[PDB]
Amino acid sequence: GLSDGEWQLVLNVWGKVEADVAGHGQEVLIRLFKGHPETLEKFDKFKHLKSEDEMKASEDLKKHGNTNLTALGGILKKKGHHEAELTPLAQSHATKHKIPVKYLEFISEAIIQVLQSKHPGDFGADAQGAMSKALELFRNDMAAKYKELGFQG
Ligand code: HEM
């Protein structure tokens, strides 16, 4: 449901992410974990990170944040016609990782907060609005796929 102008705002701010995918990734995850501690429980590899300092030093945390945002980016660049990128992610997330739609809302908030904190200047009212819509569309399509698969949307 985004307009062409809105997609261009999304992809323009995403350009900032692409310039440093792993650092953005690391910060989104740490924001996620620090704002909603229970999400940390879904990552067996990360149960020994007992603080932010531990989370910043973790090379697996950073690798994972890189993997995550790289995927998100492939989805956003498809501007809605993302069915092929989205399916495998909703498959793995509904079955293998057991991630509820609710946690997708938490990570969307952390994504927005990181963008806002690193790129105030480029992440104005219209960019904010458009990114919010894009992430909402991502969540909604993940939710619809989860229901088809027999899971809770
Ligand atoms: C923007 C939303 C998200 C994106 C784009 C994303 C992307 C990815 C990708 C690309 C992978 C590796 C391939 C795969 O298993 O499909 C992955 C794995 C994983 N994701 Fe997500 N993810 C997101 C949200 C979440 C959230 C919110 C959680 C939990 C709170 C989560 C938990 C995991 C776990 C536990 C794994 C496996 C990690 C491992 O041990 O290697 N994901 N995610």
From Swiss-Prot:
Binding sites annotated in the UniProt record for heme b: H93
Coiled coil: none
Tagged with keyword Heme: yes
InterPro entries named among the record's database cross-references: Globin, Globin-like_sf, Myoglobin
Binding, nitrite: H64
PANTHER family recorded: MYOGLOBIN
UniProt-recorded name of the protein: Myoglobin
Organism (species): Sus scrofa
